[PDB]
Design a protein around this ligand. Sequence first.
Ligand SMILES: O=C(O)Cc1cccs1
Ligand SMILES: [Ca+2]
Lengths: 557, 206
Amino acid sequence: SNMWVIGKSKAQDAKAIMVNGPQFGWYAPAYTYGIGLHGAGYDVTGNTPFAYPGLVFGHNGVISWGSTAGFGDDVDIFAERLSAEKPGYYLHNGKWVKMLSREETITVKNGQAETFTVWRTVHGNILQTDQTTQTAYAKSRAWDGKEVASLLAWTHQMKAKNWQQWTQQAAKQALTINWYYADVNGNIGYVHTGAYPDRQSGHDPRLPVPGTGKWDWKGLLPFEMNPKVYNPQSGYIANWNNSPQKDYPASDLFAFLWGGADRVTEIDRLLEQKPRLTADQAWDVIRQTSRQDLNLRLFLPTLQAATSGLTQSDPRRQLVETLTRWDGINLLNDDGKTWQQPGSAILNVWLTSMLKRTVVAAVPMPFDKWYSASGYETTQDGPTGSLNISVGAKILYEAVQGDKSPIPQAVDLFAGKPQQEVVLAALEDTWETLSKRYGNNVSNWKTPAMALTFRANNFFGVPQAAAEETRHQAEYQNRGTENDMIVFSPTTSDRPVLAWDVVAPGQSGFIAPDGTVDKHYEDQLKMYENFGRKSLWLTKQDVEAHKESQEVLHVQR
Amino acid sequence: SSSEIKIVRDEYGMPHIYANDTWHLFYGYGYVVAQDRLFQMEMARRSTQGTVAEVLGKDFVKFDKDIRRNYWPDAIRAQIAALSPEDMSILQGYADGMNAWIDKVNTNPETLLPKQFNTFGFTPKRWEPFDVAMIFVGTMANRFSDSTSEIDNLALLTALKDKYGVSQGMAVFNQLKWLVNPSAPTTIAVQESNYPLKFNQQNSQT
Ligand SMILES: O=C(O)Cc1cccs1
Ligand SMILES: [Ca+2]
């Protein structure tokens, strides 16, 4: 997910502009739900995943907000000492303590029911047990016990009218989530929220700790330690699930890293390119970053240096000159299925070959398959999420930086060979693979574009619509599942705020029993594809002015 | 009027809720959700509680098991039992609103029941506050704030120690999965602040 927030010193014709593109995958009906709430201290407008009670994206006329996932490390695993002779107990601070346990029965349509037990210790539910070592692993979340309060913090923050009131609700959201602020006076801010553990000295948060007592967390770190900034000297805040701040540690996932190669730099270059931006220019950053190859920038210098002494008829060189003439923006041909330039297919083949020669080779099987993906892997339906730089690519980037990288190269990934030789050998593999399928004339190569599918199954794999309700879009766009923009104090209108969004396929998912589809079932679908947007109304006059229908209820509790 | 809830929909069908207290306000929200997204909400309810197999059968029994092993329902109910009356009203108003439309649907299904309920062979059930809370837990906390691979990290580290020996296996683990990298591009610039904690990097817990 990405977000750029532009303050007073960088905005043109307004005092603040927030644009947010939360990436959750693409679904039918729509992952988020649009809703305006007017009453009981609330006066809000926006859209929110699964219609939560609190609006994750929206504004209240004074301040606006948005989120991206934070990816801090708020989960650790405790290795609990069991005993062969007295099951159900575990050793904690010198005594043998009984586990909590509950029985569950799974009813099954046209099958037999299944019952099983769930186990829990002071550190959390048991994920898995090793009978051979008499070890049980317990997953311990810093937020455990605060799930409801975090839902309420996201509801109450919609009533805040300034930074001080808003950060009092941010201090209660315990999940690892970046939160963002903008207001009518042009202030902007950011908070990496959540509850993080106050670990004992010597605890390395990437690996399990013994649960017998000495490694137990001390508590939770204070809200003062959460990375946060208000009105930054740059004039803007940009994030694409990159690191919040210097020296902050990331989630312990082996596939997740914050390194010198990161896709947020693509948003930074566009916002640093222009001294000020208008709302239309802030919205047009969606279209550029959606179509931008993320590995060109990273490895084009290494390619250029390697092939610099080659002759013009060497095909390894031709492949790098094609890449050098390209800006890395993918565009569909008129056929609706192949891209205009072959650059991503070249980088994909080269990078697969490079990883297989370098990182993959240094790691024992079967852990080598964790570092072989190039980042371009998809199927016919297209990517299920955002594109990113693959972990293997981030590790390869540190290795091609040489002693310019701060990470110590314990193993040499190039195994004694000069970098250039490995780069040229992978480029030989790329020419062999590509020219065989397309031929030798690079200029007529018509390589396959990625497409985008609005799936009928939700993120868990479970159907939320019939299979025929799947929607397909010809161009894959690396963008938010919804996009929403809020503009504060526009010089071009008399309204204090303007806001827009797009919720595709549409607001409603309803289909009557005779098969008649709601009128608002797919009226935002073509708007999504063309980068269009619709106005979000807040004030009573605007709402009445655009009303389509009205329903009044009389109810007593 | 304190009893009145006015629901206005705009030209894209987006609903705006005008009500005088908390319970009435969330009740109208719940009600338009049930009108617009009932099958989707019901399937999300079964997905976040592991009750998919009851309506879709044997292919979802492992899914349902995995969902129920990942939370402790009595802990969420204890949290809802401690709310104040104003906080509780958000959750109960939302479920009561949903329920008002579900009762009308279940009373006039020939015109009101979403087609997919007939396709998949089942009908909607009434909601309680616990079900609303569990939609957020299941799709927000469990999707985006529950990530760990610590156990797999250890298996990797063990394999690197076998291959390169004990101190060297550790240093290669730090090259593939560093703890921090000082050149990562950051949302907050270094002139503004840096994180103060320094962590152990040698698996010192062993
Ligand atoms: O960035 C993400 O992965 C998904 C999310 C967006 C907003 C909150 S969680
Ligand atoms: Ca951890």
